[PDB]
Amino acid sequence: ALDPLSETKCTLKSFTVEKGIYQTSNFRVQPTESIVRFPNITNLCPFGEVFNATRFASVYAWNRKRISNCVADYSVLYNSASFSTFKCYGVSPTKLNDLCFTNVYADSFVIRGDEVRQIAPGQTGKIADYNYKLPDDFTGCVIAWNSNNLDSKNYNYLYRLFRKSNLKPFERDISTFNCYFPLQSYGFQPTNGVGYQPYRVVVLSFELLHAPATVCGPKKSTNLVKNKCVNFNFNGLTGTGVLTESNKKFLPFQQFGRDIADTTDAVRDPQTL
C-alpha cells in the first residue's frame, strides 16, 4: 500500500514487472460523516402495560394488544432475568433497538409448562393446532416465564378440545359422542410439577419494514447532509450514498422506493416529509 508501483509488485507477485497497464484495486470515496434519522415519537412504549398485566388472557381467546406510536426499549425486556426464555426467530434479540417496525402486536396468554415448546413456528399439538397457531415464517420473539405464584391457586384458564378441524395461523375461534363443550380448564396448582405450572407467554409479532414505520428504537437523530458521501440510516434502512433532492412523487403510504436490483433508490425523510 506504499505507492502505486508497490501495488503493482504485490499483484504481479514479482519485484520487477513488465511495462503495461495493470488493474490493481478499487478506488472508493470514503464517507465523511454519520447521519441518523428517526421520528419525534419519543413518547415511551407501554411494555409494562403488557408484561406487567395483572390479568392475562386464556389461551383460546388470546389477548392481542397493538403497539404503535412509541419508542420501544427492548433492552429492558432482553436483559431482565425474570424471563425463563427469550427466543427470537426473525431477528437477533440484541439488534431490536436498532430497527424500526411498521407495527407491533403483543399477543399474550397463559399456557401450561409442558406446552411452552409448542409456541413456535412449524409446531403442532393440542395448544398449537387448536388454540394458537403461528405461521411458519413467523418473525418475532417469544417470551415466557414462570407464573406459579401469579396464576396457580385455579381453573380459569381454558383450552380447546376434541371437536374441530382447523387452526389457520393467528385465528381466534371462541365458539362454545353425546356432547362436550370444546374447552377444559388447566388444573394449575402451586404444588404441581414444573411441567404442570402455568406460564405467562408474550409473543411480539413483528411486521418487517415495508411502510413508513411507527415503532422505532431508542436512537438519537442527527441533522441531514446533502450532496456528500455519508453513512445514512433512515428508520433502519442503512447504506452509503449521496443524498440529493429528488423529483419523485411518492404516494402517501410508500416509505421508500427501490431499483431493479432491490437496492434502495429513494427514501422519505421521517422528520421532513
Epitope: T191, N192, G193, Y196
Partner: nanobody, 118 residues
C-alpha cells in the same frame, strides 16, 4: 406414628353412589403414591386403585373401571374414592394403603371401613 383412617362406610342400595375418605398422618402424604384395597367378607383381598402423588395418573381394577374414581388432596392429606353404580359384589371392607418406597408396607395400612351394597 403413621396412621391411616378410613371413613364414609355404610350401607348402599344397588345402583346408587357413595364417597369414602382416608386420612393420613405421620408421613409425607404429599409425596407418596396412594392406593385403595378392598376385601370382601371371608374372601381374598382385591387390588382396587392407585393414585400417584401428583395425580397425573390413575389406574383402576377392571371390575371397577368406569365406575370408581379415586382422588387425593395433599393439602388436607386425605384420600378420596368415589363409587358409582355400586353393585352387591362391591360389598367389602376398603383399605387405603401406601408404601414408604414402592410396595404396600405393613405400617401403611388403615383399619378399613365396611361398605355394604344391598
Amino acid at each position: 406414628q403413621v396412621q391411616l383412617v378410613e371413613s364414609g362406610g355404610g350401607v348402599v342400595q344397588p345402583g346408587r353412589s357413595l364417597r369414602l375418605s382416608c386420612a393420613a398422618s405421620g408421613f409425607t402424604f404429599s409425596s407418596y403414591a396412594m392406593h385403595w384395597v378392598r376385601q370382601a367378607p371371608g374372601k381374598g383381598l382385591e387390588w382396587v386403585a392407585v393414585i400417584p402423588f401428583d395425580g397425573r395418573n390413575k389406574y383402576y381394577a377392571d371390575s371397577v373401571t368406569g365406575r370408581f374414581t379415586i382422588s387425593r388432596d395433599n393439602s388436607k392429606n386425605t384420600l378420596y374414592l368415589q363409587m358409582n353404580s355400586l353393585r352387591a359384589e362391591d360389598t367389602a371392607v376398603y383399605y387405603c394403603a401406601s408404601s414408604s418406597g414402592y410396595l404396600f408396607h405393613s405400617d401403611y395400612w388403615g383399619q378399613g371401613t365396611l361398605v355394604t351394597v344391598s
